Write an enzyme that holds these catalytic residues in place. Structure first.
Site, PDB file in Angstrom:
ATOM      1  N   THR A 170      34.210   7.027  16.228  1.00 36.35           N
ATOM      2  CA  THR A 170      34.069   8.040  17.270  1.00 36.35           C
ATOM      3  C   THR A 170      35.155   7.901  18.333  1.00 36.35           C
ATOM      4  OG1 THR A 170      32.652   8.800  19.076  1.00 36.35           O
ATOM      5  CG2 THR A 170      32.436   6.504  18.390  1.00 36.35           C
ATOM      6  N   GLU A 317      26.658   6.910  17.758  1.00 41.30           N
ATOM      7  CA  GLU A 317      26.349   5.492  17.823  1.00 41.30           C
ATOM      8  C   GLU A 317      24.906   5.224  17.440  1.00 41.30           C
ATOM      9  OE1 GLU A 317      27.456   6.842  20.965  1.00 41.30           O
ATOM     10  OE2 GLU A 317      29.595   6.428  20.723  1.00 41.30           O
ATOM     11  N   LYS A 427      29.234  12.043  42.916  1.00 46.99           N
ATOM     12  CA  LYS A 427      28.727  10.987  43.809  1.00 46.99           C
ATOM     13  C   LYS A 427      28.863  11.378  45.273  1.00 46.99           C
ATOM     14  CE  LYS A 427      29.457   7.249  40.503  1.00 46.99           C
ATOM     15  NZ  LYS A 427      30.189   5.987  40.204  1.00 46.99           N
ATOM     16  N   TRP A 432      23.238  11.909  43.607  1.00 46.18           N
ATOM     17  CA  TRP A 432      23.917  12.277  42.372  1.00 46.18           C
ATOM     18  C   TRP A 432      23.587  13.721  42.033  1.00 46.18           C
ATOM     19  CZ3 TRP A 432      25.577   8.325  38.351  1.00 46.18           C
ATOM     20  CH2 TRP A 432      25.827   7.089  38.956  1.00 46.18           C
TER      21      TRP A 432
END
Ligand SMILES: CCCCCCCC/C=C\CCCCCCCC(=O)O
Ligand SMILES: CCCCCCCC/C=C\CCCCCCCC(=O)O
Ligand SMILES: CCCCCCCC/C=C\CCCCCCCC(=O)O
Lengths: 528, 528, 528
Positions: A170, A317, A427, A432
């Site tokens: 990947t 993954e 940020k 957030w």
């Protein structure tokens, strides 16, 4: 080896399947058809041919072609011999392809004829490869010639279930592609966990033994979502289209009567817009849209043609499958709009998956439907680390969980909805904010073609929002109008609705990665 | 422990299931109802109560009661703690029960009140057991009192997936019962292999997430065929009847709307003959008859009420499930008779099972549909050996395969049909003849109640046939007539149709084992 | 650790040297001077500063600057702490530098200010590095500031002598740079073997304790040929010039009275041609020309200024030093020409080196002075393999010897003379011909600037010669004249003197590698 000690191997999916009909068909689109008996014979022939070439247990064989019967035979013959199967992302730049070939240290390479020009830029810098096998479609395939001179008898070895089977490299944000790998045990467990979780569905989104399968995923990405293994275990008819063309896929669907498939939103949009699609019967088809973030409007348009559309989540993954949208019969009664909103979610986690959401300190936030955090998972089919990597491997499995890199919130019911990426969070000061929810708001404008939002540092509130927009053809509105277009909405945190910090800019062209994904890292480089 | 190294544990079936609805119900027939949230709380409470009693990782807990929520909670809480779960066959003689209790070395015993008299003959010869927990149904259960004083919070340990989870002591022909055991990995693999093999069926015999489960198997035999685990993984409604009564089971089916169950042919015959059954709707029910050799006439009678009847094969050393009858849509169009013949077969092997038939020298006979031999299997969920046994363990796994002890033939399609047992074969001279096919021919007579066929040694043709028959009420036909009744048929090997060696004898009463199976070993003792 | 068991560590070269004068000087050219006592204090201060930054035993620290006292302090402080020292070839392309940084997985980076622009193209693709330390020359060096706040006391650990100390990533023909590494034991043995072999010379080429050392080798290449270690062990005065400029090096030689140095032929040519060199005293200087193939005419010109010139051989996989030219007093009496021919040879092997010449089958050809073959060596200071490489590592140590890649012949006396490279041999039919001997013959022409000779395949005699030449300014001679220029010579094998197969071609510009070495691989690509 102890015969009473069972090892979970890939050969058991082929020779001990759920169902096996020797007269069931494998179809390579308009090129070839054979049966499951011929397919088994060809797998044994390919094992013999590989053994003659000197492929031992530890060797690596790299494959480079389209979706075909040859790729399906490589998905089996190479792992059973004990070798490693390296799927090459033919859409990367030739430099990255060369890097992955060097990193994996392949011995044989099976490359399609059409990908030969790529190899012509790379071949002078390859040392490990000793044989090139050129795949063709008509009569001069070297793969077919190698098969033809080998016997259809082979005794497949019995080894440890923890021997590596596949690798595919990947490419994320690291700078060089990262190699992920799986074992026989992990692939077998993935096939049976997913078959048990979604084959047992009550009525809606189920893959059964009467389906006809046809992939619309590149099949070098993530094992085509593990779907060829599941389809061959069920012993269903399989159709392989080769090079994806919208009007050849429609012909295949109409003629071979395909009922189950999987793609990404772009291919589904291309199919539903094709002129021949309008005069076709779609009410037997169950496409799975798990590429990236199934839009609600595309889902609504696909629902009006009576297509069973649902979304899934995976990461390359992770097997890849982690979550699937599954609708209860109570939910299969709502109208299109509510169904569109349900079907476009990330979905509930599948059997044997843990799927928590944590903060930056791994604190396992509650599942209230509002609080967002990064998803961390445990599953039987995750890569232990990156190949030949130490620091990235440690950052991946930090805190005893696999970090996905996505920010989402989870309902009390269990539905997940991914809001953004971890690296794309703004940020601003002490909170957030997702940058994804801003982009679509600007996309709603009539004179914008594509929006990318990044964050510039700012002393008192930290990194703040910044929108880069490309206008349409013969449309010219200054940034002042665009600033007021988003200000019309309400219900945002911080300063009123986050108005004075947008600083929208107009860009002639936006940098894109090799595959076609917007490159927000170099966008920061050229704007900072 | 490595967090990236996944262990297949039973706690993952409960906390990482295919589906989980907190408001789904667990029903103990006419006694109790709670939800899945309460069920999880009670599992944690039981783990706490067991920890307080001093049950460590290696300990053994023996359970003795009917089918209830308590047994379902023991199926989970005891293995998760790390302890061993010993299911006690309450139908054995108290001497054999005492032998199994001594052999297993239990520490705690959970015994129902109704089984207390049995314990009164055995209790003076038990040394290992330190606590007796008396289970009751109304208000004075000690299990409920132990639960009530414990918290609903528990952190279940993570151990190796190869730790033993269950033992239950099958009784065959050895003279003493033989203990078979399984691990966490084997049970998890069994649940997922069977869910994947029969949940993915096209339309006929499928267990899905909208079913309502209710066992009619003693649930101490073979983990109730692994079905409670599969049903709790799917998160379906479960009904437990307790003590099997034909007219209480019918009420449960009518009122709780049960759709999936499993029993043995005797219980199915008792249900279909009950007076209340005639006025009931059965066309939503999918009983699985896998006890022993589903008769074709019972199958035909159950098919006329529109019940999805099918057979399965297991052995108590094998998980147990090895093969299941699954009908293709081409076969779901035949009339009752042909469907009855298809549904009463042993069936095709399930995912990840090998299932060869060999001769006495392990030569792997062909699958032509006529040649018979003993079935030898390899599967992920077989006992490695007998507990505390060496020579029987070696005889079980002889030649690298698990020997089942049944003689069958396999079609080219894959359908298995068990003809007889290995020990019941007549070794007439140089050929092997099944004694089962003879018994039913004599059973067809109008004046015979039960037939048992054994073999007496005879110098030139070895052991020869011999039939022991018990006549009906007010029926008296001499053995000469019975000899001529079977002679009317044709198409048998050896001497004409095997006529002069029958030597049928009339027996007032036939010896039966403790469970109720005809004892052909002592029949040989008293007749030889 | 057993105190009676001695480990060969780098700290023993610094604290147990051959000689140590606390008032001996370390000079950084026109910038700084301190003594050996201050140098030891600064090494301890740097160890303290590295420990504060979190550099553990296994970590890697990458250095990127010129020749200075800072590099000399890094040559010691980093290995003694236990960490790895990664020297970065600042002359590679930034892509290759990024590849080596990623492959080595550095944690800290010490980069000179002048190399900051290079880092500006690479920094966005680096993940492992957590600190950048910017080296400057005047007052704002961060290295000096880090030193200033640390104590001059440190107890250096005792570990195994087989722990890796240095890595530097040579670039050859593979396509990606290959990482070679050495241990403490190997570097200590290299320093003492070379000191014993050439410090014990009778009179001519000896490094002793009264010399003044000054490197003219990049010092990131091969540990500067191991010379800083040898010079600090002897406790001699050392001068570091920084960035090589021909007229600043001459000033340093004149003023600091340098007697021993080492460079490559290009720098020596630049120095001897500089206008200030003509009025300088050179008859105390002992430059070692071991870069690549000291020409005889340059050697003759350097001998007329009374400079002790001699050649050495190394390979960057080999320590590097393998052979050194050493003249007996009988040979120190010949005139310039014969001395020039002796001093420009590859030389005799040093202590503890084996140095055979073999054929393609490893047959150990005789040492007759004519027969050529590839040099294979065994020495105490060779890399066992390439870092993170398997197939190239096996090709390197094939047959139990390290393959150098050079083709040479060895006299009976012991003098080696490298003729060509293994990959550049012309495989004309059944014999091997060096392509190097042809290039200089064409170079002798008055109208040619540079010649590169490669080999084109030809059916009957295999690959044949082919010369690519670039003409001088205002010189235009057709290829026909050049063909006849080389034909004038005699004494060659095969067809007469190898005349009809030259096929010389005129090239406007010749492809060169990043460092400046002619790229004969891509020359084959664009000409084939
Ligand atoms: C009946 C079960 C078969 C269908 C299973 C669902 C298919 C998986 C779809 C969701 C997972 C998405 C996987 C792709 C994400 C990785 C990105 C990629 O490699 O392209
Ligand atoms: C949807 C899958 C659930 C149903 C699985 C089939 C149930 C198993 C039936 C056939 C196996 C028979 C097992 C009993 C044999 C052992 C004898 C015993 O212990 O009573
Ligand atoms: C008194 C002994 C000190 C002098 C030792 C001789 C110096 C070594 C000279 C010959 C070896 C050449 C090493 C360079 C070859 C590797 C190429 C490189 O890294 O630049």
């Amino acid at each position: 080896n102890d015969p009473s000690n069972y090892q979970l191997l890939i050969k058991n999916l082929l020779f001990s399947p759920v169902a096996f009909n020797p007269e069931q068909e494998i179809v390579y689109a308009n090129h070839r058809r054979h049966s499951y008996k011929t397919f088994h014979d060809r797998v044994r022939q390919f094992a013999n041919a590989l053994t003659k070439m000197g492929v031992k247990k530890g060797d690596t064989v790299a494959v480079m072609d389209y979706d075909s019967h040859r790729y399906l035979e490589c998905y089996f013959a190479i792992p059973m011999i004990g070798a490693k199967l390296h799927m090459i992302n033919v859409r990367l730049s030739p430099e990255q392809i060369l890097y992955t070939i060097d990193h994996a240290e392949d011995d044989i390479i099976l490359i399609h004829e059409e990908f030969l020009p790529i190899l012509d830029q790379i071949k002078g810098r390859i040392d490990t490869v000793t044989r090139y096998v050129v795949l063709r479609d008509d009569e001069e395939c070297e793969y077919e010639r190698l098969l033809e001179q080998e016997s259809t008898e082979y005794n497949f070895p019995d080894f440890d279930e923890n021997t590596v089977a596949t690798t595919f490299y990947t490419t994320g944000t690291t700078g060089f592609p990262k190699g992920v790998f799986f074992t026989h045990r992990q692939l077998v467990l993935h096939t049976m966990g997913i078959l048990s979780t979604i084959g047992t569905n009550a009525s809606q989104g189920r893959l059964h033994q009467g389906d006809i399968y046809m992939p619309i995923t590149p099949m070098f990405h993530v094992h085509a979502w593990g779907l060829p293994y599941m389809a061959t275990m069920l012993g269903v008819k399989q159709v392989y289209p080769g090079k994806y063309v919208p009007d050849v896929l429609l012909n295949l669907i109409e003629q071979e009567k395909v009922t189950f498939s999987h793609c990404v939103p772009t291919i589904l949009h291309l199919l539903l817009s094709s002129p021949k699609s309008k005069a076709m019967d779609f009410s037997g088809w169950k496409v799975v849209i798990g590429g990236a973030a199934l839009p609600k409007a595309l889902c609504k348009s696909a629902l009006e043609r009576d297509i069973d559309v649902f979304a899934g989540y995976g990461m390359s993954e992770t097997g890849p499958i982690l979550s699937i949208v599954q609708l209860t019969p109570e939910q299969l009664e709502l109208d299109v709009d509510q169904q569109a909103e349900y079907r476009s979610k990330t979905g509930k986690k599948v059997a044997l998956v843990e799927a928590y959401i944590v903060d930056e300190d791994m604190n396992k936030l509650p599942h209230d439907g509002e609080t967002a955090g990064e998803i961390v998972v445990r599953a039987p089919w995750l890569t232990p680390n990156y190949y030949k990597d130490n620091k990235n491997s440690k950052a991946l499995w930090r805190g005893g969980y696999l970090h996905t890199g996505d920010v989402a919130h989870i309902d009390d019911e269990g539905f997940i909805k991914i809001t953004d990426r971890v690296k794309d969070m703004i940020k601003i000061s002490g909170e957030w904010v997702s940058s994804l929810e801003l982009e679509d708001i600007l996309h709603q404008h009539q004179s914008v073609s594509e929006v990318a939002v990044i964050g510039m540092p700012h002393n008192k509130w930290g990194e703040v929002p910044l929108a880069l927009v490309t206008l349409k053809e013969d449309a010219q509105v200054t940034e002042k109008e665009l600033l007021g277009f988003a200000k019309d909405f309400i219900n945002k945190g911080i300063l009123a609705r986050e108005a004075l910090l947008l600083k929208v800019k107009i860009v002639d062209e936006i940098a894109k990665t090799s595959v076609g994904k917007v490159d927000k890292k170099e966008l920061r480089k050229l704007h900072l």
